[PDB]
């Protein structure tokens, strides 16, 4: 419970959305609940543009957008499933963009929670049955199976 993960923190996104669109769509539940500052998204964007968070993993591309922890009010996590792949720049400096389709936006300010959530993300994104299921499932199912791992 060190982290707030609500039901409306899980949502699907249409094909006509850009990188900023994803960030804004995912940050707003965090904003409404007052989990982060009210211009969280602008910060996340600027942080992504300098330190890209695209992860080249098979078979479902992941990105994990965040910002400085000094913008978080309480720990929270917002998930987004893309209908079509959207390009995130690769977190490792590789020329080729990650075809992201699952996005874990992190609004964490507690260090001991940050490390734990990252370790978890690393574990989950190497489970191809899980990652693939996240596409076909609905919000609740997604919420359910992710919560079952928290």
């Amino acid at each position: 419970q060190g982290i707030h993960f609500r039901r409306h923190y899980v949502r699907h996104l249409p094909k006509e959305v850009s990188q900023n669109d994803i960030i804004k769509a995912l940050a707003s539940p965090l904003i409404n609940d007052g989990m982060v500052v009210s211009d969280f998204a602008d910060h996340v964007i600027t942080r992504e543009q300098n330190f890209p968070t695209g992860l080249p993993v098979e078979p479902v591309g992941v990105a994990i957008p965040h910002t400085d922890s000094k913008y978080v009010r309480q720990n929270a996590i917002s998930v987004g499933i893309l209908a079509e792949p959207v390009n995130f720049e690769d977190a490792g400096g590789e020329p080729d963009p990650v075809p992201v389709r699952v996005v874990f936006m992190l609004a964490l300010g507690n260090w001991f929670d940050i490390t734990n959530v990252l370790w978890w993300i690393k574990a989950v994104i190497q489970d191809e049955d899980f990652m693939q299921q996240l596409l076909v499932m609905n919000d609740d199912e997604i919420y359910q199976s992710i919560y079952t791992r928290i």
């Epitope: 000094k70 978080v72 977190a91 507690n110 260090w111 001991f112 490390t115 370790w119 690393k122």
Partner: antibody, heavy 131, light 109 residues
Framework: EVQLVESGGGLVKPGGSLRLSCSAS????????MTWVRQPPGKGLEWVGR??????????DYAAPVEGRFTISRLNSINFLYLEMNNLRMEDSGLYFC??????????????????????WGRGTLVTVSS | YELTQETGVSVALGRTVTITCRGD??????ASWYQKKPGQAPILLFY???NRPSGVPDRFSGSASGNRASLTISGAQAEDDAEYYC????????????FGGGTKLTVLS
């Protein structure tokens, strides 16, 4: 341009109390994790404890031989770090350092809670616990 | 001192020397490295998997394998004659930290 100056060390009888201070400058003390480290005489560096920042709720962690006796605190308004020591023993004596604490975690190989490192140190203040 | 270091290691001036640090927690956590001379504050030399703080000479490097961690001074100088400590978690997954016993590096010639 970081500057840390420990103070408050001195001679104290076993069982006694003592309060070490640390004036911090040159950086953002407020959101900075701070750590106390000591060096007993003729021995090496020893980690005493560390206070975290705002996101962590100013949580503090302590070394086992010191847990329960010592208290780490901060007053961010004048960038001071403190170390409240009670019920001292001979082995509590040494040179006490304060140091700016950085957090490190590598994503692909890391294991929570990653690691803490000590980028800036002060000169230390001498604690002597003798009868 | 669950992190074990060599008591003393010598190195000819100009030559290359590696000090190591071993412990079970190193299988999970990196170490960071400090130089200390008596009467002076310690100096952070190296941390992480590949991180050296600015202002620290290039002769210093850290590395890691299995349950051990090691600092390598390439082309040891007179100034390098000091104490070196490593620091890391005391156990795997620990919020606490710990220091090795410390290696005295005397520079020869």
């Amino acid at each position: 341009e970081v500057q840390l100056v420990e103070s408050g060390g001195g001679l104290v009888k076993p069982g006694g109390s003592l309060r070490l201070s640390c004036s911090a400058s040159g950086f953002d003390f407020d959101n900075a994790w701070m750590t106390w480290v000591r060096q007993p005489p003729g021995k090496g560096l020893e980690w005493v404890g560390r206070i975290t920042g705002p996101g962590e709720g100013w949580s503090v962690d302590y070394a086992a031989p010191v847990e329960g006796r010592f208290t780490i605190s901060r007053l961010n308004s004048i960038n001071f770090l403190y170390l409240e020591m009670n019920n001292l023993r001979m082995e509590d004596s040494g040179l006490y350092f304060c140091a700016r604490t950085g957090k490190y975690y590598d994503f692909w190989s890391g294991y929570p809670p990653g690691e803490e490192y000590f980028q800036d140190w002060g000169r230390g203040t001498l604690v002597t616990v003798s009868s | 001192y669950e992190l074990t270091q060599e008591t003393g290691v010598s190195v000819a001036l100009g030559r290359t020397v590696t000090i190591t640090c071993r412990g079970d927690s190193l299988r999970s956590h990196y170490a960071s490295w400090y130089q200390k001379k008596p009467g002076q504050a310690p100096i952070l030399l190296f941390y992480g998997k590949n991180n050296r703080p600015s202002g620290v000479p290039d002769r210093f490097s850290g590395s890691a394998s299995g349950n051990r961690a090691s600092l390598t001074i390439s082309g040891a100088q007179a100034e390098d004659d000091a104490e070196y400590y490593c620091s890391s978690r005391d156990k795997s997954g620990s919020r606490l930290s710990v220091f090795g016993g410390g290696t005295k590096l005397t520079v020869l010639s």
